[PDB]
Amino acid sequence: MSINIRDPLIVSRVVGDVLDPFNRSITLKVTYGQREVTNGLDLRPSQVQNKPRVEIGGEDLRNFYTLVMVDPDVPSPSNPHLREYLHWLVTDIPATTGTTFGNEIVSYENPSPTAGIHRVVFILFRQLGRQTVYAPGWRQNFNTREFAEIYNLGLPVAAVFYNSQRE
Ligand SMILES: [Mg+2]
């Protein structure tokens, strides 16, 4: 068939629940301690207690990127009425650098799921310009599609997710 049925972002419903279809075009590497996040990797809450290191690609150093980190499975995947929970929001990340050079306008909150296996999703967007993104007023019931529309973030240029569950 011509339709992709195997991409982990499709199989997990990250594309669907959270994201529209998009083309990966910028590298994104998220590392918790020594562990690089790969799609569907299981990480325990102790492993993600502190913010990860985030390195991004890009070829035009003039460009700025926003990183969104959300849990769509809140409070549980079977009753996700708080979808999405915003764990982290970092803006103005210069191309080819990472979140430490960006503005962490919603601080990292470490995941601590207490009901089921939760997807924890990192999404990178190219900004229209520096300083164009503002914070939401709340972390629960966040909506990445709506936020991206409001702040002219277009479609993702990269995304990856891990799975986490209570120990
Ligand atoms: Mg809700």
Short mmCIF file of C-alpha atoms in Angstrom, two decimals, residues 27-149:
data_model
loop_
_atom_site.label_atom_id
_atom_site.label_comp_id
_atom_site.label_asym_id
_atom_site.label_seq_id
_atom_site.Cartn_x
_atom_site.Cartn_y
_atom_site.Cartn_z
CA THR A 27 17.37 16.47 13.56
CA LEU A 28 16.28 16.26 17.19
CA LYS A 29 18.21 14.40 19.89
CA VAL A 30 16.87 14.21 23.44
CA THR A 31 19.15 12.55 26.00
CA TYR A 32 18.21 11.76 29.61
CA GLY A 33 21.54 11.22 31.35
CA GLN A 34 23.16 8.63 29.13
CA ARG A 35 19.92 7.44 27.46
CA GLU A 36 18.92 8.84 24.06
CA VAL A 37 15.18 8.91 23.54
CA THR A 38 14.02 6.77 20.65
CA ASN A 39 10.40 6.29 19.72
CA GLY A 40 8.66 3.99 22.17
CA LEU A 41 11.57 3.61 24.57
CA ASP A 42 10.46 2.88 28.13
CA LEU A 43 11.85 5.28 30.72
CA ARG A 44 11.02 5.11 34.39
CA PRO A 45 10.12 8.27 36.31
CA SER A 46 13.46 8.16 38.15
CA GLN A 47 15.23 8.39 34.78
CA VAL A 48 13.43 11.58 33.70
CA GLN A 49 13.48 13.42 37.03
CA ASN A 50 15.63 16.20 35.51
CA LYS A 51 15.32 17.95 32.19
CA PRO A 52 17.02 16.16 29.27
CA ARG A 53 19.73 17.54 27.04
CA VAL A 54 18.24 18.61 23.73
CA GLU A 55 20.33 19.08 20.59
CA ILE A 56 18.79 20.22 17.32
CA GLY A 57 19.92 20.46 13.73
CA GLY A 58 19.25 23.09 11.13
CA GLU A 59 21.27 24.69 8.35
CA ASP A 60 20.19 28.36 8.52
CA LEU A 61 21.66 29.75 11.74
CA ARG A 62 19.25 32.71 11.49
CA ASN A 63 16.30 30.46 12.38
CA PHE A 64 14.81 29.93 15.84
CA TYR A 65 12.96 26.83 17.09
CA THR A 66 10.35 26.02 19.78
CA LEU A 67 10.34 22.75 21.73
CA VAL A 68 7.07 21.45 23.19
CA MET A 69 6.96 18.52 25.62
CA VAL A 70 3.51 17.04 26.31
CA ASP A 71 1.83 14.01 27.91
CA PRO A 72 -1.47 13.34 26.04
CA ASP A 73 -2.45 10.45 28.33
CA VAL A 74 -3.48 12.41 31.44
CA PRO A 75 -4.58 11.49 33.94
CA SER A 76 -4.63 8.09 32.23
CA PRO A 77 -4.67 6.83 28.65
CA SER A 78 -8.18 5.39 29.17
CA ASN A 79 -9.55 8.62 30.76
CA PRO A 80 -7.40 11.37 29.20
CA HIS A 81 -9.66 14.29 30.05
CA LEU A 82 -6.68 16.56 30.84
CA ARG A 83 -5.04 15.94 27.44
CA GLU A 84 -2.48 17.43 26.84
CA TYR A 85 -0.31 18.04 29.90
CA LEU A 86 2.42 20.59 29.04
CA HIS A 87 5.66 19.50 30.73
CA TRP A 88 8.07 21.94 29.09
CA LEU A 89 8.09 24.81 26.61
CA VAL A 90 11.36 26.25 25.27
CA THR A 91 11.50 28.97 22.63
CA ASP A 92 14.05 30.91 20.58
CA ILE A 93 16.39 27.91 20.35
CA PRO A 94 19.04 28.92 17.79
CA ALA A 95 19.46 26.53 14.91
CA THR A 96 22.18 23.89 15.49
CA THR A 97 22.25 24.41 19.29
CA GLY A 98 19.79 23.22 21.97
CA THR A 99 17.41 24.16 24.75
CA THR A 100 20.12 25.53 27.05
CA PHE A 101 20.49 28.41 24.58
CA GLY A 102 16.70 28.76 24.33
CA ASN A 103 14.17 30.43 26.60
CA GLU A 104 12.45 27.98 28.97
CA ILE A 105 9.18 29.90 29.27
CA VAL A 106 7.37 26.94 30.82
CA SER A 107 9.80 25.15 33.14
CA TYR A 108 10.44 21.40 32.97
CA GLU A 109 8.10 19.36 35.16
CA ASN A 110 9.22 15.77 35.48
CA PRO A 111 6.63 13.15 34.43
CA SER A 112 5.15 11.05 37.24
CA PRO A 113 2.32 9.00 35.72
CA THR A 114 0.11 7.24 38.25
CA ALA A 115 -2.36 5.49 35.93
CA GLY A 116 -1.21 3.42 32.96
CA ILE A 117 1.48 3.80 30.32
CA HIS A 118 1.82 7.42 29.13
CA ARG A 119 3.34 8.69 25.91
CA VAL A 120 5.70 11.61 26.53
CA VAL A 121 6.23 13.57 23.33
CA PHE A 122 8.85 16.11 22.25
CA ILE A 123 7.90 18.28 19.28
CA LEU A 124 10.11 20.82 17.51
CA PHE A 125 8.75 23.72 15.44
CA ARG A 126 10.48 26.38 13.38
CA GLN A 127 9.37 29.85 14.51
CA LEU A 128 8.42 32.69 12.21
CA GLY A 129 10.84 34.88 14.15
CA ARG A 130 12.60 35.34 17.43
CA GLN A 131 10.43 36.42 20.37
CA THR A 132 7.13 35.51 18.67
CA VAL A 133 5.98 32.77 21.07
CA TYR A 134 4.23 33.41 24.38
CA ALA A 135 3.29 31.11 27.24
CA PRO A 136 -0.11 29.46 27.75
CA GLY A 137 -1.95 30.17 31.00
CA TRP A 138 -2.18 26.57 32.18
CA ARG A 139 -0.47 23.21 31.76
CA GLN A 140 -3.55 20.96 31.69
CA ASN A 141 -5.78 20.64 28.61
CA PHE A 142 -3.02 22.13 26.48
CA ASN A 143 -3.48 21.75 22.73
CA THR A 144 -0.35 21.69 20.57
CA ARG A 145 -2.30 22.12 17.33
CA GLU A 146 -4.02 25.26 18.65
CA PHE A 147 -0.88 26.68 20.20
CA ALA A 148 1.07 26.24 16.98
CA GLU A 149 -1.67 27.98 15.02
#
